[PDB]
Design a protein around this ligand. Structure first.
Ligand SMILES: Nc1nc2c(ncn2[C@@H]2O[C@H](COP(=O)(O)OP(=O)(O)O[C@H]3O[C@H](CO)[C@@H](O)[C@H](O)[C@@H]3O)[C@@H](O)[C@H]2O)c(=O)[nH]1
Ligand SMILES: CCCCCCCC/C=C\CCCCCCCC(=O)OC[C@H](O)CO
Ligand SMILES: CCCCCCCC/C=C\CCCCCCCC(=O)OC[C@H](O)CO
Lengths: 292, 297
């Protein structure tokens, strides 16, 4: 586990999680989003514990209270992100979620000090265009405030995890385990603070059937769980933040091939612009090694 | 005459020419652009000879047939723009004309061999955003769409083939300013009358009534201001870089657009403003890029 294998790994799970959540679990637009994530991180936790007794990990209290900010950034990342999409459109959220990419690249400079290649700067802007270009080819204040929060919480999150990982020599699995376990409590705070619970009404909603999807989702979410922390650790907090935005293209590109859906050339340019953005960013990484 | 002083000259001239064509001569959208522009190239021609005898330039036959493409490239650059602008909105025309900056920067690779700094690449992409961002912040048979984009594809290359070749033949023929100004004005004058019959419709019973003593007087007014840009356009490309002239020219319209928000109580859009300040960022990156290029060697 090192090198570009991280990125190919992150794809299959984000590819698996996108398909599986839309093919395996049809209409996963549940009443309580955090509960699905609570299981996705809980089914992930159980899966690891089964693996410890068949051979991976460790348990501390010194590292423990230093990771809680990361998890708290995660759930807040979702709460802010979840709240952004309530008042915001999907394409524009990508634009700001793509604008977050830049600061994350320059946020790594404040945690590790590296320089942002002028070529890397070009790639991110192309995603911005590919983001805007796609946005300009579609239709549909409260939102922007939460997106201003998602941009920062998603940044401080992916940044800090990468910090504490290399600080506590957290090998993979270790990253996965702590993020799954420590998020479990915080989700119950936001699950109780945000969702509506009613034993008269919702106790019937997520019945014996629905949980099958939430656990099915968790098993598929196992991939993304392990690979996210593996990507940030080996490569860069920028690399993980970039691949996440790039993934939706082959998924979006798959949506145009595998589907007879009304399209627009503007939408296509965005996807191919995003594809270009990777090539520049892919080559940009090359110029860092060769130059130095 | 050298260095960034060129840019202010090309800027001030493009700015003075913008006002003079829009405030002093309102409805500068004439029925026959080539004749209006033919005068602008004639007053420059007339203007130059008076200075030729008051002190700058030269006339050849070896230079002549190597310069004819520029005037033809120059006038053709306009005809494509005029015909492109018929089917396209002002902001969208801006986007592609800013995309030519990329090829022009990379067209220089085919003409002189310099490298396009990744930092330079950043600016050009940003210019796209300030252009793209503004377009998304605006209002306005398929076979009617495409005719514009088609005419724009030619303007983009002729706009490239134009400023590119001139800068080469300029540095090849040591064309000092005026020479750049003179030759493009002189050799273009005939082509302008060429396009005058090729495009315009003439009717002395009807069109003779259009260009009256007011409008006819105006056609000279615009040329008087265009003396700057004419001398400064070729001055800009020569001293700095064929990219710089293609960049500063695109940069100029920001402060004029910024004037529209300040000097005017006009409905605005934050997107429009973001675009403009995005453009300023575009310059600063390009300014540093030029700064990092000269510093390196
Ligand atoms: N470290 C860690 N990360 C996790 C875990 N579980 C989920 N994540 C991460 O939480 C994020 C949210 O999950 P996804 O729904 O898979 O998001 P996505 O595929 O990355 O897509 C995002 O960008 C798209 C545009 O490119 C958007 O369309 C999408 O809505 C979302 O914002 C992802 O980055 C995922 O890797 C876990 O246990 N641990
Ligand atoms: C509602 C909209 C809200 C506002 C939307 C804003 C969009 C901002 C876009 C791009 C910013 C790019 C910033 C680039 C800063 C670079 C500074 C720097 O340090 O550059 C060094 C680099 O190496 C030089 O190549
Ligand atoms: C509304 C439309 C918006 C769409 C906008 C689309 C822009 C695409 C145009 C040009 C790509 C220019 C990038 C060319 C690739 C540069 C490669 C490079 O610099 O390579 C150096 C390499 O490392 C060897 O040294």
């Amino acid at each position: 586990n090192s090198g570009p294998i991280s990125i190919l790994s992150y794809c299959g799970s984000s590819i698996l999680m996108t398909v599986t959540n839309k093919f395996v679990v049809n209409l996963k637009d549940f009443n309580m989003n955090f509960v699905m994530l609570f299981v996705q991180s809980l089914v992930c936790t159980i899966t690891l514990i089964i693996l410890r007794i068949l051979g991976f990990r460790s348990l501390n209290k010194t590292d423990a209270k230093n990771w809680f900010p990361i998890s708290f950034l995660l759930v807040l990342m979702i709460y802010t992100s979840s709240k952004a999409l309530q008042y915001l459109a999907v394409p524009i959220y990508t634009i700001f979620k793509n604008l977050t990419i830049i600061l994350i690249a320059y946020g790594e400079v404040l945690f590790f000090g590296g320089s942002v290649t002028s070529m890397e700067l070009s790639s991110f802007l192309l995603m911005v265009l590919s983001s805007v270009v796609a946005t300009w080819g579609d239709q549909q204040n409260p939102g922007y405030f939460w997106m201003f929060t998602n941009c920062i919480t998603s940044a401080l999150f992916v940044l800090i995890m990468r910090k504490r990982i290399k600080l506590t020599n957290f090998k993979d699995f270790d990253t996965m385990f702590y993020n799954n376990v420590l998020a479990l409590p915080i989700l119950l705070l936001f699950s109780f603070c945000v969702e509506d619970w009613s034993s008269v009404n919702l106790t019937n909603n997520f019945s014996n059937d629905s949980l099958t999807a939430m656990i099915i989702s968790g098993v598929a979410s196992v991939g993304i769980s392990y690979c996210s922390g593996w990507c940030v650790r080996v490569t860069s907090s920028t690399t993980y933040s970039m691949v996440g935005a790039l993934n939706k293209l082959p998924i979006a590109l798959s949506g145009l091939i595998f589907f007879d859906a009304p399209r627009n050339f503007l939408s296509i340019l965005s996807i191919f612009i995003g594809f270009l953005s990777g090539i520049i960013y892919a080559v940009a990484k090359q110029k860092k090694q060769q130059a130095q």
